[model samples]
Target: KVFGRCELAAAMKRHGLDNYRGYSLGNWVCAAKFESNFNTQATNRNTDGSTDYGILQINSRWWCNDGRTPGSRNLCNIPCSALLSSDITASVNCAKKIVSDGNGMNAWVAWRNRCKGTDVQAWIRGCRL
Candidate 1:
């Protein structure tokens, strides 16, 4: 699904992600922008040959199963494809689990490499919520 910045922010808030999980909302938004540009169906093949799924680019190696990758632990217990949907509840829940796993937003390369220590306010700019 496609979401404008404001619409995505509203959805994130509705999912209780705004200022949740000890991370700033702007950081999450910025990560989403860099990860998938807010596209629910986004997927990418990393240089290491693992596939990243959905808006957060969650890896199949540890998070979910996509059938193509071997040795997947399926830690989230949901198919990777499930994340590639407009309804992001599962994705958010999995992300929270990942955060609780001790890495925090560092689990996402985009967050660490781009959103970290950056002024992410532009991610929610003009959203007003």
Candidate 2:
């Protein structure tokens, strides 16, 4: 469960990771994948029918993206599946800002946490170079 080629490239550019895929994105993708399987519509179900929604595990009901039930078209404006869309970097950057600003695992924190790990090199080329 990871981003395809174009998705990865777009994310790399949007986040300023600059071809830092395996180096910076591998761990992020790894965690998100584990959490949501990279599915934009991924949701987690509790004992009841209520479901937490979206890629980063955002709950759609309590917190709407941009307070809009449908969410903002540009994920850069708010949190939604748009961040997990082809423009992966938008989502990545948003998460970075949240983690740095809020000092915790905002939805986007998964990527930053992934980037800081030691064994992420195998996911990208020239990591050991």
Candidate 3:
């Protein structure tokens, strides 16, 4: 049985993500729907028709700097260097990293504060931090 939103929240809590507040429920569901269609098993291929796999659509070849990926791989097995790394933790931290590069959590918190009530792009681009 795969996790739905509530079950995913429980999983997040188990992973010590209780403090996360980056998204409203609808926002998160929308992002997930847009990014992976809520399908954990989703994967995409490279332009050369090579192997690139994952639900968040992380491409292992780019991260590995190698064009070859083993057959029968999935999100769970995408190499650690992949941009999103095929892990939810990686996605969260990466998102924060993108939002708050060297400044760490403070920048994220600040941006979060400033971006309230704005759309995501505006939050990302114009939010004060």
Candidate 4:
């Protein structure tokens, strides 16, 4: 597990994600909480036979190769397993690339469903950063 809400927010801020790519830190925290609960090793098998990887639950459909799939867009150019590590730099970097694709946080279903127009400030309730 990467962090609880407050710690994750502090860490994200330290890593320059607070306002990165025009996305609020709250958005990233909210999406991370709902997507994988901050577990870096998180994975889920989707009904579509694709898998979501890591804390952000990046889709294998276009982000990473799981070996079983014949082709993946792999815009991040990293192995899916790399996302499952405790070190989240790779995942964060990949996520930056994803949001820059003109989709914003809309690429993450969790963000779309839970964070859009929601008051995500609570995600960092105790975070002084």
What clash count goes with each model?
0, 2, 0, 0
User: In model 1, which runs have C-alpha deviations exceeding 4 angstroms?
Assistant: none
Tell me how far the alpha carbon of residue 6 in candidate 4 is from the true structure, in angstroms, after superposition. Answer: 1.4
- Candidate 2 lDDT (Cα, whole model)? 0.49
**Local lDDT at 18 for model 2:** 42
For residue 84, model 3's alpha carbon misses the true position, in angstroms, by: 13
For model 3, residues 1-129, the per-residue Cα lDDT tens digits are 233555544444444433344443333333444445545555566675454333234445333333365442333333534533334665443343333344433332323354345464421233221
TM-score of 1: 0.92
Query: What lDDT tens digits, residue by residue, belong to model 1 across residues 16-110?
Result: 88777777678878989999999999999977667998888889889998888876679999999899989989899888888889877888988
- Report the poorest 10 consecutive residues by lDDT, candidate 3: 120-129
Give one digit per residue, the lDDT tens place, for model 2 in 1-129. Answer: 345534643455456654332234555545555566666556665553334544466544333353444432333455555544544544555645444544444344444555444575445444322
Error of 4 at 33 (Å): 0.5
Instruction: Quickly count the clashes in candidate 3.
Output: 0
| True lDDT of residue 13, candidate 2 | 45
Q: What would you estimate as the lDDT of candidate 1?
A: 0.86
